Structure formats: C-alpha cells, structure tokens
C-alpha cells in the first residue's frame, strides 16, 4: 500500500443541501446543510473531503467564511504540486503553515485519505486498520464489526413541554435507533431525563448532552440525575475546565464524557494521564482529521478508555470517514451519524448512508467517494475556487 | 467609577506602519506593522483598541484576514447599540457569540476599557487596580511601580554566526535594556546561550525562547544549558504538552516558563493547580483582553507564580494596555515592549512609548489613546468598515 501522491490540482466546492428536517441548531434555525468539499487531483484520480464548520463562530471560533479564507489563501495553495510520501507526512505538511483551523485541515486531510484509498483500490476501513497497526494499536483493538450502531440526538423542545420531548423519544424507538441522548441545560435537566428514562426503561442506552452549560458548583443537579442511571453525562462543563470535570466525576455515580475538551491527540495524552474521564467522544472534524482521530483512538484503547463516534454533523461524505473508523472495537456505544434519507430525503445527500434496524454498514468499496458521481456533486454545489 | 456606556458607533481602521528595523519574523520578512484598530463611540467620546494578528496562521490559527471577517460580520455588529453595565458584562457579551478568535476579542475588549477610562477621566492603571481589588487580588499585589523594565529579544542570526548574535547582545547592553532573551531551536542552543551568558556575565537577566521547537526527549540539551544559569526557559515544548513541560522542569535546574500554553484564565486555573510551571508570561492579545489578563494575574499571584509581560508585538496602542498592567508587583522580570523610536522612528508609532535607561513609564493620563490624535490615526491607516 503506497501512501504517496502528487497534488496536481485542487478545487473547492461549496455544497448546499436542503434539510428535510430543519432542526434546532445552537444559533437558531437551520433549513440547509452548507459545507465545503475539497477536491484533490492526481492525474485522473480524485479524492474528496468535507469541511463542515458552522456559519457562526460558536464552535472553536471557526466559521464557513474563515474556513474559506484559510483554505483559499493558505492551505490549498500550500499543498498544490506537493508530493507527500505518506499520510503522516501530509499531516505534518498541513499543520506546518497552519495552526488551529481544524475544519479546514480536516477537509484537506480526509480528501487525501480518499485519494490514497482509491489509488490503491482499498477500503477506508482497511487503510485505517493498517495505520492503527503501524502505530502499535493493541491487537484486541484492531478487531471490528462491519457496521456501526446509530443513536438519536434529541434537543430541548421550544415549547418547554416534557410531552413534546417524549413524543420524540417514542418516534426514535419506532425508527429503530439503538440509543438516545437528550439535550440539557440548567433548569431543563432532572425532569426531562426522568421522563425519558421511564419512556424507554432502565435498560435503554441513554445519556445527556449539556453542551458545557453547567458549572461544578451545580453538581448537586447531577447528583439528582443519578437516579435516571444513564450511561454518562456528555460534556457537562466548560471544555477547558478539565480538573472540574474530573472533580464532578468524583462527586456523582454517573460517569463524565468528554467531547469538546478533546481537541487533539496531545491534549488526549495528558487527559488520559490525569484520569479526567473514562469515556471520550471522537469527532474527526473537531480533531482536524482521521490520523489525529486514530492517534486518539490508540491513546484511549491503551488506557481502557471507552469511545463512541459523533459528527457535527457533516454531509454523508464527512460521515464516511467516521463510519469506517467507528466500527473498530474501541467504539462501544452507538454513534451520532445522520441517516441520509431522514434528513435530506432519499438520494439527496452527497453520498447515501443508510440506517437499517439502527445500524449503518461500513462500505467495502474504496475510500469515501466511491459512489459520488461528479454530476451529483455539481448538482449539490458549485466550484468556488481552484488552482493547478 | 461607572463601567457602563452605550455603543452608539463602531469603526474599524487598518493601520500600516513602516518598520525602521525589519526583523526576522516567524514566517520570513516583515518590513511593516499591519494592524487593526477598533473605534467605539459613545456620544462624542471614543475608545480605541488594537487587534494585532499575524498575516499567516502560525499563531492560534488567526490571521489579519480571518480577524477582519470575525470583526466585520460578527463581533462589531453584535456590540452596536448595546449598553453593557460593566467591563465584566461586556466581556461576557463579546464571548457569547464568538469562541476562540482572541485577537478580534482583544481589540474590542481593550477599546471598551479605553472608552470607560476616558469617560471617567482616569488612568488605565487606576482602573486595573480597582478591578484587581474588586476581584479579591491580595493586598500585596495591588502594589506597583510607576514604570516597567524593558528587555531585548534577540533572534537566531541568518548567517548562523555566534558573533552576529554577540554583536547584538553588545548593542542591547549599550541601548540600556535590562534583560536579554535569545531565540533557540534544536542545533542552535547550548553554544549561543553559552557565548551570550559570558558576554553579559552570570549576573545579567537572561532567558531562552525556544518557541515550542523542542520535545521532552531532547531534555538532555536543556541539561547542558543548565551551566548558563539563566532565569528560565520560555515555552520550550509544544503548547499543549502540559505534563511534558512539568516533567522537563523536574529533569533540570533551570525553571520552565509558559507563554503559548496560557491561553485563558480557565486554563491558568488548572495549570496552577497542577504545578506545571512557576513562571508565566502574560500577553493580553493571546488571552483575548485585559480582564482575562487580570484574572490570570490573580491566579498567578494567589499561587506565588512569577509573572512577566510580553507583546506580539502590537503598535504602541496595544502596548499601552500591557504597560499599565505590567507595573504591578506580580510582574518581576523585564517585559517585551517595543520602544516606539527604535522600531518606527520617533513620533511614527500610533502612540509613543519611550524607553529611558531601560524603563518605560506608566502613563497617568486617562486610558490608552489620550495622546493619539485623530489625524495621526488617519495618517497611519484607513477606516475600512463602520456602522452606526
Ligand atoms: Mg457533544
Ligand atoms: Mg514567547
């Protein structure tokens, strides 16, 4: 398996996909998925990757606009004409001239995996396993399933009615989702979790996602939520309040899960060393690409830390990168991955990811974009920048 | 002292100042200081603040261009018409809609201090002391001098000759600087530090700045540099390698100083708790403004952690914010602040900061922009955006 390719051409598409289900985002409405697609060309081969920042700067400070700037003016010109010897060398290359900006780096890094996967006629999953192996990931954690399990994510209902949330819990069960997580924030916490737990039974995989909206001195609220016996509480405090997150964990029975805190493998290293949390969420976009995600996977599995996969979400294309990764043994709870048909309508996503009885199967074909036709890409978006 | 004001108008200037001394920046040449100046208007009063990002994304990932985007499209519109009740409430306001992007937030936050200082006819230093006091900073650390000491920062000479560095050490002593720090990186380390130490004598305040260019497994190189007996090593490892930085500190005699790692007061909290480092550098731009800097000051002085002030550097305007702050007792080594005359020529900086026998005196007049005429601002830059 060769990991080298020459970057003969690069292009940037802005894709726009109408949401069949406008959902409550973190800054209001959201009728449409608006994303960037990086196209890397070697000869006649093309790799594609997605950067999916928000339009508002509430997540790491990056926006669609700043991501365009970084990509057009710095990152895409830097890689043009380059001939990296490996995935690791390409990772070094893209980080060199650009710190932060993980969404921009992710779209470029993922496109390179796609290009290499296709050039080698091999599945993403296969490349990931090999990389894992080369990095010295423990044999037990090179094992995998051929699917990921899929969980529902439920917001806080705009009418503040528990029954509106509960109607959605019922729909999620009927739809086949294998796990539910519900949004919480101070004042919308113990009650919704209580009514949810009983709508699904103690047995059903359930967790909260507070989106950092609590502080440690509100710990008693978590104490009260211990009765719902959920699997963990996802990111309850500020992403930089690492010791507070460890301390909360010591005051309650329900474990604490990190999402926003885990911004890189370097951070993962010392978070593992300090025993801040035993349950980590992995979002490829958050960490700036797949290799970084894999390095984090090694650190977690080296330390008995349980993983599960999440997404921003991106389009089906970005999700492909997570889908291959998230089937490995390290991943032990259902992932947040959007089933194409539900959110965009059948066939309307950039690529189709299908949920059957709460499972999404891992593609065996090469790379991420095997089933993306150029004309479908051109139908969903426009080339906004290019250079040869 | 009122801390409230209504934001009747906001403007953005791009200033451009020809460097009399083009210096070796982190991405090549640098003939000119290019910065942004935020103007906030209440009635007939104006506050000014500087955002000074680099043009390339090697520092936190923010650039002049992304900073413009964030400011124009998000931050400046958000504050227009607002009437914050305090500096703390304005800080909350600017962080709400925008995470990361510390340079953008800093220019806006500082402009608000300037506006409030002028409206109250009081010195920045006086407002800082009061805020410090309100935050419960220990009485001993409300003490201050009426000047800061100024240190030289020397780069790695392009010809790789030790004598070229040493000629610069001699010039720095003749110029009156009270401290020298020299750039290092692997392969340019023990020798330059050795030749520097003796050119100045064991007595002279001296430290290294590796700009994160080493890893922990290169620790023996630091061991060898212990003979030069300098005050500390500034940011020797990656900014996110916190435990590695603590560990390096345990393997050598020379203390480790944090710069890039200290990105916020939340991070400062747990870095203090963990005893990563006993010597911290404070850059107002890095932490996103003066209140954040003050919160970090409290954490350090609460824990016996020694401080010193640094700058990006900005223009004289940005430096004003540091100059008032850095005179307090917590600051125990000379600061990196550019003397206007040296770098731009006399009177050519946006505002003039004068070094006399290696000291820069703290202004007693109100705020930061007391001596900045509108026509001088218009001579150094252009209004590029505004809204009323
Ligand atoms: Mg999450
Ligand atoms: Mg420094």
Tab-separated table of N, CA, C and O in Angstrom, chain B residues 179 181 207 231-236 239 242 245-246 255-284 286-287 292-311 322 325-326 328-336:
chain	number	residue	atom	x	y	z
B	179	UNK	N	17.370	43.343	30.337
B	179	UNK	CA	17.272	41.896	30.222
B	179	UNK	C	17.424	41.516	28.764
B	179	UNK	O	17.078	42.295	27.877
B	181	UNK	N	16.670	38.104	26.110
B	181	UNK	CA	16.260	36.726	25.867
B	181	UNK	C	16.704	36.354	24.449
B	181	UNK	O	16.681	37.196	23.571
B	207	UNK	N	17.215	34.811	29.504
B	207	UNK	CA	16.471	33.572	29.271
B	207	UNK	C	16.423	33.182	27.797
B	207	UNK	O	16.823	33.968	26.934
B	231	UNK	N	17.489	32.533	33.841
B	231	UNK	CA	16.355	32.676	34.749
B	231	UNK	C	15.309	31.599	34.510
B	231	UNK	O	14.675	31.108	35.450
B	232	UNK	N	15.117	31.237	33.243
B	232	UNK	CA	14.124	30.224	32.891
B	232	UNK	C	14.194	29.907	31.397
B	232	UNK	O	14.922	30.573	30.660
B	233	UNK	N	13.487	28.888	30.960
B	233	UNK	CA	13.368	28.615	29.556
B	233	UNK	C	11.920	28.835	29.166
B	233	UNK	O	11.054	28.184	29.649
B	234	UNK	N	11.714	29.749	28.242
B	234	UNK	CA	10.398	30.136	27.807
B	234	UNK	C	9.855	29.188	26.768
B	234	UNK	O	10.455	29.000	25.751
B	235	UNK	N	8.732	28.566	27.086
B	235	UNK	CA	7.965	27.733	26.158
B	235	UNK	C	8.807	26.777	25.328
B	235	UNK	O	8.847	26.894	24.156
B	236	UNK	N	9.521	25.874	25.965
B	236	UNK	CA	10.464	25.006	25.232
B	236	UNK	C	9.778	23.912	24.387
B	236	UNK	O	10.318	23.461	23.347
B	239	UNK	N	2.762	23.813	22.969
B	239	UNK	CA	1.880	24.492	23.944
B	239	UNK	C	0.846	23.602	24.640
B	239	UNK	O	0.344	23.935	25.741
B	242	UNK	N	1.392	19.840	28.311
B	242	UNK	CA	1.476	20.361	29.663
B	242	UNK	C	2.239	19.486	30.641
B	242	UNK	O	3.064	19.978	31.403
B	245	UNK	N	5.884	19.485	29.955
B	245	UNK	CA	6.539	20.701	30.402
B	245	UNK	C	6.858	20.625	31.893
B	245	UNK	O	7.927	21.058	32.321
B	246	UNK	N	5.930	20.074	32.673
B	246	UNK	CA	6.161	19.846	34.095
B	246	UNK	C	7.325	18.868	34.276
B	246	UNK	O	8.211	19.089	35.096
B	255	UNK	N	14.250	26.737	35.666
B	255	UNK	CA	12.786	26.632	35.607
B	255	UNK	C	12.221	26.776	34.192
B	255	UNK	O	12.907	27.285	33.296
B	256	UNK	N	10.983	26.318	34.004
B	256	UNK	CA	10.294	26.399	32.710
B	256	UNK	C	9.243	27.494	32.780
B	256	UNK	O	8.534	27.633	33.777
B	257	UNK	N	9.154	28.287	31.728
B	257	UNK	CA	8.173	29.357	31.706
B	257	UNK	C	7.143	29.053	30.631
B	257	UNK	O	7.497	28.597	29.541
B	258	UNK	N	5.873	29.335	30.928
B	258	UNK	CA	4.800	29.152	29.958
B	258	UNK	C	4.445	30.455	29.256
B	258	UNK	O	4.365	31.502	29.879
B	259	UNK	N	4.223	30.385	27.949
B	259	UNK	CA	3.740	31.536	27.202
B	259	UNK	C	2.527	31.057	26.429
B	259	UNK	O	1.387	31.221	26.880
B	260	UNK	N	2.780	30.441	25.273
B	260	UNK	CA	1.720	29.919	24.414
B	260	UNK	C	0.690	29.027	25.099
B	260	UNK	O	-0.471	29.045	24.717
B	261	UNK	N	1.092	28.243	26.102
B	261	UNK	CA	0.135	27.393	26.822
B	261	UNK	C	-0.971	28.161	27.558
B	261	UNK	O	-2.077	27.644	27.750
B	262	UNK	N	-0.677	29.381	27.994
B	262	UNK	CA	-1.599	30.090	28.879
B	262	UNK	C	-2.619	30.862	28.060
B	262	UNK	O	-2.523	32.067	27.934
B	263	UNK	N	-3.614	30.170	27.525
B	263	UNK	CA	-4.485	30.810	26.539
B	263	UNK	C	-5.716	31.481	27.142
B	263	UNK	O	-6.408	32.234	26.458
B	264	UNK	N	-5.970	31.231	28.427
B	264	UNK	CA	-7.189	31.732	29.069
B	264	UNK	C	-7.030	31.564	30.553
B	264	UNK	O	-6.151	30.826	31.013
B	265	UNK	N	-7.891	32.222	31.308
B	265	UNK	CA	-7.861	32.057	32.753
B	265	UNK	C	-8.340	30.670	33.184
B	265	UNK	O	-7.896	30.149	34.208
B	266	UNK	N	-9.237	30.054	32.417
B	266	UNK	CA	-9.671	28.696	32.768
B	266	UNK	C	-8.518	27.723	32.678
B	266	UNK	O	-8.368	26.829	33.509
B	267	UNK	N	-7.689	27.904	31.664
B	267	UNK	CA	-6.526	27.058	31.534
B	267	UNK	C	-5.535	27.383	32.647
B	267	UNK	O	-4.966	26.489	33.259
B	268	UNK	N	-5.372	28.668	32.940
B	268	UNK	CA	-4.480	29.089	34.011
B	268	UNK	C	-4.833	28.410	35.340
B	268	UNK	O	-3.949	27.969	36.081
B	269	UNK	N	-6.128	28.339	35.637
B	269	UNK	CA	-6.606	27.706	36.873
B	269	UNK	C	-6.020	26.326	37.056
B	269	UNK	O	-5.439	26.023	38.094
B	270	UNK	N	-6.196	25.462	36.067
B	270	UNK	CA	-5.735	24.090	36.263
B	270	UNK	C	-4.236	23.918	36.057
B	270	UNK	O	-3.628	23.027	36.648
B	271	UNK	N	-3.627	24.803	35.269
B	271	UNK	CA	-2.178	24.828	35.180
B	271	UNK	C	-1.551	25.209	36.512
B	271	UNK	O	-0.492	24.691	36.868
B	272	UNK	N	-2.204	26.109	37.252
B	272	UNK	CA	-1.723	26.454	38.590
B	272	UNK	C	-1.914	25.281	39.559
B	272	UNK	O	-1.025	24.951	40.337
B	273	UNK	N	-3.099	24.693	39.528
B	273	UNK	CA	-3.416	23.532	40.355
B	273	UNK	C	-2.407	22.392	40.152
B	273	UNK	O	-1.949	21.759	41.117
B	274	UNK	N	-2.035	22.143	38.900
B	274	UNK	CA	-1.137	21.026	38.587
B	274	UNK	C	0.344	21.306	38.821
B	274	UNK	O	1.167	20.403	38.703
B	275	UNK	N	0.686	22.551	39.131
B	275	UNK	CA	2.086	22.942	39.284
B	275	UNK	C	2.932	22.657	38.053
B	275	UNK	O	4.057	22.165	38.147
B	276	UNK	N	2.386	22.973	36.886
B	276	UNK	CA	3.120	22.806	35.641
B	276	UNK	C	4.350	23.717	35.554
B	276	UNK	O	5.430	23.302	35.103
B	277	UNK	N	4.184	24.962	35.971
B	277	UNK	CA	5.237	25.961	35.856
B	277	UNK	C	5.050	27.104	36.839
B	277	UNK	O	3.923	27.537	37.096
B	278	UNK	N	6.160	27.614	37.367
B	278	UNK	CA	6.100	28.692	38.345
B	278	UNK	C	6.371	30.072	37.769
B	278	UNK	O	6.491	31.049	38.530
B	279	UNK	N	6.517	30.147	36.444
B	279	UNK	CA	6.821	31.415	35.769
B	279	UNK	C	5.981	31.512	34.495
B	279	UNK	O	6.127	30.683	33.594
B	280	UNK	N	5.109	32.526	34.441
B	280	UNK	CA	4.133	32.698	33.371
B	280	UNK	C	4.339	34.005	32.631
B	280	UNK	O	4.565	35.037	33.244
B	281	UNK	N	4.252	33.947	31.309
B	281	UNK	CA	4.215	35.146	30.504
B	281	UNK	C	2.778	35.541	30.212
B	281	UNK	O	1.902	34.682	29.963
B	282	UNK	N	2.523	36.842	30.270
B	282	UNK	CA	1.195	37.369	30.003
B	282	UNK	C	1.186	38.243	28.756
B	282	UNK	O	1.880	39.250	28.696
B	283	UNK	N	0.419	37.829	27.761
B	283	UNK	CA	0.200	38.650	26.552
B	283	UNK	C	-1.287	38.833	26.475
B	283	UNK	O	-2.045	37.865	26.388
B	284	UNK	N	-1.692	40.093	26.500
B	284	UNK	CA	-3.075	40.456	26.509
B	284	UNK	C	-3.787	39.969	25.257
B	284	UNK	O	-4.911	39.452	25.326
B	286	UNK	N	-3.004	37.384	23.493
B	286	UNK	CA	-3.108	35.927	23.486
B	286	UNK	C	-4.346	35.492	24.263
B	286	UNK	O	-5.046	34.552	23.869
B	287	UNK	N	-4.619	36.180	25.370
B	287	UNK	CA	-5.713	35.769	26.257
B	287	UNK	C	-7.050	36.428	25.947
B	287	UNK	O	-8.061	36.125	26.583
B	292	UNK	N	-9.315	39.293	31.185
B	292	UNK	CA	-8.804	37.939	31.199
B	292	UNK	C	-7.379	37.956	31.737
B	292	UNK	O	-7.031	37.145	32.616
B	293	UNK	N	-6.565	38.898	31.254
B	293	UNK	CA	-5.215	39.055	31.759
B	293	UNK	C	-5.221	39.280	33.274
B	293	UNK	O	-4.398	38.720	33.991
B	294	UNK	N	-6.126	40.124	33.748
B	294	UNK	CA	-6.232	40.392	35.179
B	294	UNK	C	-6.670	39.155	35.992
B	294	UNK	O	-6.202	38.956	37.124
B	295	UNK	N	-7.549	38.344	35.458
B	295	UNK	CA	-7.973	37.117	36.115
B	295	UNK	C	-6.814	36.151	36.228
B	295	UNK	O	-6.662	35.473	37.189
B	296	UNK	N	-5.999	36.116	35.195
B	296	UNK	CA	-4.782	35.307	35.213
B	296	UNK	C	-3.777	35.848	36.241
B	296	UNK	O	-3.145	35.072	36.993
B	297	UNK	N	-3.614	37.167	36.276
B	297	UNK	CA	-2.803	37.817	37.312
B	297	UNK	C	-3.205	37.365	38.729
B	297	UNK	O	-2.341	37.052	39.556
B	298	UNK	N	-4.509	37.341	39.009
B	298	UNK	CA	-4.972	36.911	40.323
B	298	UNK	C	-4.590	35.466	40.598
B	298	UNK	O	-4.148	35.129	41.696
B	299	UNK	N	-4.755	34.607	39.599
B	299	UNK	CA	-4.454	33.188	39.794
B	299	UNK	C	-2.973	33.006	40.078
B	299	UNK	O	-2.595	32.297	41.023
B	300	UNK	N	-2.128	33.647	39.269
B	300	UNK	CA	-0.686	33.573	39.493
B	300	UNK	C	-0.304	34.057	40.890
B	300	UNK	O	0.401	33.374	41.629
B	301	UNK	N	-0.755	35.254	41.251
B	301	UNK	CA	-0.291	35.854	42.489
B	301	UNK	C	-0.884	35.114	43.697
B	301	UNK	O	-0.273	35.079	44.766
B	302	UNK	N	-2.058	34.509	43.515
B	302	UNK	CA	-2.628	33.641	44.539
B	302	UNK	C	-1.721	32.453	44.787
B	302	UNK	O	-1.697	31.906	45.888
B	303	UNK	N	-0.987	32.037	43.758
B	303	UNK	CA	-0.186	30.816	43.869
B	303	UNK	C	1.334	30.996	43.911
B	303	UNK	O	2.085	30.028	43.809
B	304	UNK	N	1.786	32.234	44.049
B	304	UNK	CA	3.211	32.510	44.173
B	304	UNK	C	3.897	32.346	42.836
B	304	UNK	O	5.111	32.170	42.776
B	305	UNK	N	3.106	32.380	41.765
B	305	UNK	CA	3.665	32.246	40.403
B	305	UNK	C	4.175	33.596	39.883
B	305	UNK	O	3.466	34.594	39.943
B	306	UNK	N	5.405	33.604	39.368
B	306	UNK	CA	6.074	34.823	38.973
B	306	UNK	C	5.575	35.166	37.571
B	306	UNK	O	5.359	34.270	36.766
B	307	UNK	N	5.366	36.453	37.305
B	307	UNK	CA	4.883	36.903	36.002
B	307	UNK	C	5.851	37.842	35.282
B	307	UNK	O	6.666	38.516	35.893
B	308	UNK	N	5.735	37.910	33.959
B	308	UNK	CA	6.367	38.981	33.231
B	308	UNK	C	5.486	39.243	31.989
B	308	UNK	O	4.712	38.369	31.574
B	309	UNK	N	5.544	40.457	31.457
B	309	UNK	CA	4.652	40.825	30.352
B	309	UNK	C	5.335	40.718	28.998
B	309	UNK	O	6.522	41.002	28.869
B	310	UNK	N	4.581	40.310	27.986
B	310	UNK	CA	5.098	40.247	26.631
B	310	UNK	C	4.098	40.884	25.691
B	310	UNK	O	2.968	41.186	26.086
B	311	UNK	N	4.524	41.098	24.449
B	311	UNK	CA	3.660	41.640	23.399
B	311	UNK	C	3.950	40.902	22.090
B	311	UNK	O	4.983	40.246	21.962
B	322	UNK	N	-0.737	46.659	28.007
B	322	UNK	CA	0.250	45.902	28.777
B	322	UNK	C	1.070	46.777	29.741
B	322	UNK	O	1.349	46.367	30.888
B	325	UNK	N	-0.783	47.413	33.066
B	325	UNK	CA	-0.877	46.114	33.747
B	325	UNK	C	0.461	45.643	34.296
B	325	UNK	O	0.543	45.181	35.435
B	326	UNK	N	1.517	45.744	33.490
B	326	UNK	CA	2.786	45.127	33.846
B	326	UNK	C	3.615	45.842	34.937
B	326	UNK	O	4.696	45.376	35.317
B	328	UNK	N	2.464	46.306	37.989
B	328	UNK	CA	2.048	45.794	39.312
B	328	UNK	C	3.084	44.813	39.857
B	328	UNK	O	3.864	44.240	39.094
B	329	UNK	N	3.085	44.632	41.181
B	329	UNK	CA	4.093	43.826	41.876
B	329	UNK	C	4.253	42.408	41.361
B	329	UNK	O	5.341	41.829	41.437
B	330	UNK	N	3.170	41.823	40.863
B	330	UNK	CA	3.235	40.448	40.357
B	330	UNK	C	4.271	40.269	39.252
B	330	UNK	O	4.826	39.188	39.077
B	331	UNK	N	4.554	41.347	38.531
B	331	UNK	CA	5.469	41.296	37.384
B	331	UNK	C	6.890	41.544	37.852
B	331	UNK	O	7.216	42.647	38.309
B	332	UNK	N	7.737	40.511	37.755
B	332	UNK	CA	9.053	40.518	38.388
B	332	UNK	C	10.240	40.372	37.435
B	332	UNK	O	11.394	40.332	37.873
B	333	UNK	N	9.989	40.300	36.128
B	333	UNK	CA	11.095	40.375	35.187
B	333	UNK	C	10.743	41.415	34.103
B	333	UNK	O	9.569	41.694	33.887
B	334	UNK	N	11.759	41.977	33.437
B	334	UNK	CA	11.520	42.951	32.361
B	334	UNK	C	10.640	42.413	31.238
B	334	UNK	O	10.701	41.220	30.881
B	335	UNK	N	9.837	43.307	30.670
B	335	UNK	CA	8.806	42.942	29.708
B	335	UNK	C	9.316	43.094	28.283
B	335	UNK	O	10.245	43.837	28.042
B	336	UNK	N	8.667	42.411	27.347
B	336	UNK	CA	8.947	42.613	25.928
B	336	UNK	C	7.988	43.682	25.457
B	336	UNK	O	6.828	43.378	25.173
